Symmetry: D2
Subunit: 425 residues, 4 copies
């Protein structure tokens, strides 16, 4: 229908140049796709109550950040318990349950050369409390990431380490840091004090670009909606900043004081949700997909090969979604690196993977709770139907839509190799 092609900036998406794409952007072309950039909300006195946390989950919070620069272990354990209580209050409806990751943001090295003794204690607390992600403060070199990894020990091998780049050395040694990290956070607060303020946008754009090229999550952080700490509406520079972080290629956008101590924590989440949805429809996928395809090296890994074939197939038919079965989240991450317009619905039995895939733009995790079927092919089909039923309930899919389904040839992580075109009935 004609109406389909008038929505989600589809006239601007069909443009032959980026300049023409900009000219065709329409404030009346409503976004239809689900919001794909994750919202990280920092937990504090304004967002700690179980009832307030339920409102924030409904508004769109995907990751709960615990800032270990403030508060004791007792304070953070209570925050964790309140987050988990608010998250599990929706578990009664498995088709609409939304997993929420828990990220521990470290205090940092301070004047010392490497890992502080408080960071070692806080990291062990994170492992003991089952945190999903570590936002490692002031990472300056690859050995800083290795020290964080060693402090997590053998039980914390599954925790994702997102390195915070906050100073000149971190920016200069970026490639070596990204190589050993699971992702990056552009920590603009400290970065804007360590380097000239007028240069922070160059560091942000460079880091987002390099993370997109590497296929690793990148978080844009600090003062995105600062004025909303005390005011109900953000400034014109703030909405522009959020939209441009998404247009730059950020996987995640963050709220610090806006949710930790502000008067509008839920409204700050709703604002980031609204801007991100508008900005994602304004992404010029024609150039972005071509450039990601061109920049990506040849690969003999079947997951990587299946992912690009599936994204190409999704664009060919305007698939509403790519439904992927994943154990670690990796198959969903490799799909996400090609920035499909289709939602990546990731069906998993791992509660930790369902939480961690929020780091990857466009990945919508579904936690499947049923015990495995005796016949593995039936177990596989049941999970794909779970992804379809949740997708229909949430508005991702309708009858008549085409979906791309991504599976593997045997159970266990690392064997994704199949892509199939499916019609929604």
């Amino acid at each position: 229908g004609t109406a389909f092609f008038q929505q989600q900036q589809l006239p601007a998406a069909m443009a032959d140049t980026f300049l023409e794409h900009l000219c065709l952007l329409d404030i009346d072309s409503e976004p239809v796709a689900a919001r794909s950039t994750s919202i990280i909300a920092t937990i504090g006195p304004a967002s700690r109550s179980v009832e307030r946390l339920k409102e924030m989950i409904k508004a769109g919070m995907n990751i709960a950040r615990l800032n270990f620069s403030h508060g004791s272990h007792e304070y953070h354990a209570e925050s964790i318990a309140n987050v988990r209580e608010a998250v599990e209050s929706f578990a009664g409806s498995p088709l609409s349950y939304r997993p929420v990751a828990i990220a521990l943001d470290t205090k940092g090295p301070g004047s010392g050369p490497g890992l502080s003794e408080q960071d070692v204690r806080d990291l062990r607390f994170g492992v003991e409390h089952g945190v999903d992600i570590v936002f490692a403060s002031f990472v300056r070199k690859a050995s800083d990431v290795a020290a964080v990894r060693a402090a997590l020990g053998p039980e914390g091998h599954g925790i994702k380490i997102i390195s915070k780049i906050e100073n000149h050395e971190g920016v200069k040694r970026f490639d070596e840091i990204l190589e050993v990290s699971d992702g990056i956070m552009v920590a603009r607060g400290d970065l804007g004090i360590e380097i000239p303020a007028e240069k922070v946008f160059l560091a942000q754009k460079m880091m987002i670009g390099r993370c997109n090229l590497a296929g690793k999550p990148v978080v844009c952080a600090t003062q995105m909606l600062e004025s909303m700490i005390t005011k109900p509406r953000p400034t014109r520079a703030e909405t522009s900043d959020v939209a441009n972080a998404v247009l730059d290629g950020a996987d995640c956008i963050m709220l610090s004081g806006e949710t930790a101590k502000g008067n509008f924590p839920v409204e700050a989440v709703k604002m980031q949700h609204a801007i991100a949805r508008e900005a994602e429809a304004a992404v010029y996928h024609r150039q972005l997909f071509e450039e990601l395809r061109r920049a990506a090296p040849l690969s003999r890994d079947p997951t990587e090969v299946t992912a690009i074939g599936a994204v190409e197939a999704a664009f060919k038919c305007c698939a509403a979604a790519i439904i992927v079965l994943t154990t670690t989240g990796r198959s969903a991450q490799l799909l996400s690196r090609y920035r499909p317009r289709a939602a990546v619905i990731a069906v998993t039995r791992s509660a930790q993977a369902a939480r961690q895939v929020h780091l990857c733009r466009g990945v919508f995790p579904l936690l499947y709770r049923e015990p495995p079927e005796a016949i593995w092919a039936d177990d596989v089909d049941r999970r794909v139907q779970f992804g379809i039923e949740s997708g229909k309930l949430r508005g991702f899919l309708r009858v008549g839509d085409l979906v791309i389904v991504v599976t593997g040839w045997r159970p266990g992580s690392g064997y994704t190799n199949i892509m199939r075109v499916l019609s929604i009935s």
Copy 2:
């Protein structure tokens, strides 16, 4: 994992270039072709190429389609030619490394002075149906109704025969779109075309028709005087080798030999020359731009076969896949893969002898006729044909242990349900 030698062969330095100009600059006469020859060779059967022994040599040299020119000879003469082709083809049933299907094409005499289908073309088309020909090269197609007349003449039994319309005059060129729409493919019949329009304009008609056929995903044949001097000489001129290479680089699915094989002194050598040039020219194709342009020009599709095909070709390029193995009954799944011009060979596994012969019209499709009895469990039968394609691939040199192959199948039996693409590691 593959080695530096792998990336020096088959013009891979030129293939990785960022511009077409740089691609040309990187072409290397020392970069040897490794991939199997993907552009089919059509050889016209005549007095110089009719004997069963000569036909065996032509099959070994690379002939994929045997052309019977109904402008010369009687039905009895052509039936004997057909029987000799089939005898030469079946002489390799004892060697899997050599049994290759060969299509039989009937080239019509034409309408002559008359308006539509001639009495003789009607009788000759009937002969083709009765003798089980795979393809009709319809002479002097001028409009869509000419194709409908040929199609109507393919009686109740011959609706599966492919109609390749020969464009040989100004009207055929001008009404090209309407002709291509109702035809299975096109032949740029340069002999008559070069007499009907100014000779210096034929290259424009050839390039335009090949481009439109590539955009439509329909077979296009480049024909006439490609290696003309080889009718009396053992080596072609510099213009002739250039012409064969440029037909492949233009986007032709097939290249043809007429007098060179029908009446010449070197029919086998003419086939060998076309084989050698096509292999070199296929490695020199600038896939980076070709794939992007085919992708961009092709419209969005809700047909799972079309969606699977582009996903599979994208996957093949990503891993330098040795091959795309496709299960096909009509050949359609192999044809949709072929339209995206993959560098990987498209190994088409079919139980249909006719589809095996007819897929020679599509560039890069290597048919394998499968004759094992069907399995009770369908998924087992699918696995069996996939493994058959892998093992013939290994036997013929297409594949080795450790290679990656893309596999295209459907979710249920019967034609029309292709929707699956898998990445398999060769064990």
Copy 3:
């Protein structure tokens, strides 16, 4: 590398490390982003003009001199506040600060004066106060009118009529502040000299989360049309009270420049804030960084692909001159202009080279600040008897002022754009000159 090797040996590796030149040579936009370097220092003069709103914090002659030195190019008078007497005093103080630097072209900086109207209010068209204020603008020789709440072409015809026969030279920049203005954008741009994305009202008239779409669409259409576009409101809002902006504010200024804005504006930051000079310095610092980060390879190709073929020799010369400037990494394009139009056509192709515009019109020298990358030089030397000698003298004046100001160096290549006969509209010549 081979496409920049001889010039790398000639100019040196240090030349190609500065002004984001490694990012500028990238083959894709993604690679361009990856190559952005915080240590790659900007070298070129700031090309995006800064409009500063004059008010109690920025009205004194001494403060205005500091703002001109900080980088203010256009002084905005907001007619929503203050009397005609108040604005006439503001104008006189701006002119006094401007003329305090008039001893030489090396120190002189023309500053345009823009009148921002109160607006229609609840009424359908031009208010009686707007008619009076527009007549005040003509009488006080304002260069630009920022017309508030333009909703259709007839609104700009009414502003043009209220300016009368004496105000035909005044540039009308239409402020788009509501849904109707955005929807009827093409008809408004057609009859306007330029556009202002007035984000303050726009953010209240349409959903706040959609303002960035309106800004990017309007900047893109203005760039395609070759008309000035101003990005306005809350760019450095926090600097009204604080000496440093927030991370969203520096990002907003940089992104307005990267979007393609010709001008960036300061309202409360300079009119009533505690740090008006620091707000100007911050915009100057960010614009210089953002201009070097522009991906000229794609921008120039897209401006060429989107622009229709032209039989206007000024338009043909402009693209040839910009192409020539990119081929040799020209330090400047020196153009002779009566109305500013030849400099504007050069500016639409977004050259990396500075466009030094030599003119005798004081008004054109002020108004060309609306065009990104145009540096106006007001020529006051006595005329030559022979027209060809007079042209050559103005070209040499451009080169001398360029050299003494740091824009040009001995050894540089400069592109010179002139016409074949006197009078506006005859530009048709492009010359490649080596600086000695």
Copy 4:
């Protein structure tokens, strides 16, 4: 009607595939033929009357094959060419200069320059030849030996290196660096390397020469069958069209004109095909790729050339009129493959003959009286290019032209591009 001719619908296409789809056999070529025709002079084309017909048919360069015939035979050929060329000097606005190229016998089994090549090269200098087609060039030192044998009097002669064997192809870059241009000598090349690989060598060499901005000639068996038949084969017309589409500056005729029964018809056939093939060139991609690949430059002639070609495409300029002493300014314009004709106005007779090596350069030998004021003299040569262009069909009143001149007399000072309206 303007946009229906010269494949302009195909020229406006957004992809090369769409460009091919839009090629129209009814879209007539209107631009003058840009690719020069080199015709080999022999028994079938030696008479002054025959040579006049070949000049009218389109011959731009006369090739003397020193593998056959004596010095007396070649001197007579040269004199007959010059007599046929000067028979048209009565109409200066339509006079066509014709270059004379000497094709050497070659080294044979020898390591360097043979004694016959030294004698033949000295003959060329003494008879004022414009170009040397140096046979079997295998390395840069082979070009240096040819250059030394030409001596101080043969400084101005262009050396076009013939690549005819494996070594020449492998050492191509070093050969091109010291040569004025290249000839893809397909006859010997097709015997020295496998025949099925010659097209790879041709396309690589044409591409590298286009990148370097140096003339490249496609040679041998282009219309071979026309030695005995009045019409060529379908492979032959395709070969001529593809050499032009590949980017060749010149196309050659050997036996077709030297000994064949239809030398004039062979020239007419190459002219007709080249005109059709030049209109089918996809300039949108070609200009962008040549523009992207041409390195950054601080040479004002180079900078003016790109500005002028960009300006010509922006206004659909009928021509770029350039003033040149050595031909260099016209060559730098030619390397960007403008659709506009490059009308090169020169006082040098040798430069007018030699610029035939550069595709799209139409030489005008200026023989009008000088003007006292240099500025007036320049403007007069510009009007001469405009009137010659008007007479020859190139230009009409109302057209736009780009004019490329310098700031002072003498070679090497081009730095000005101007947009001029015709009449």
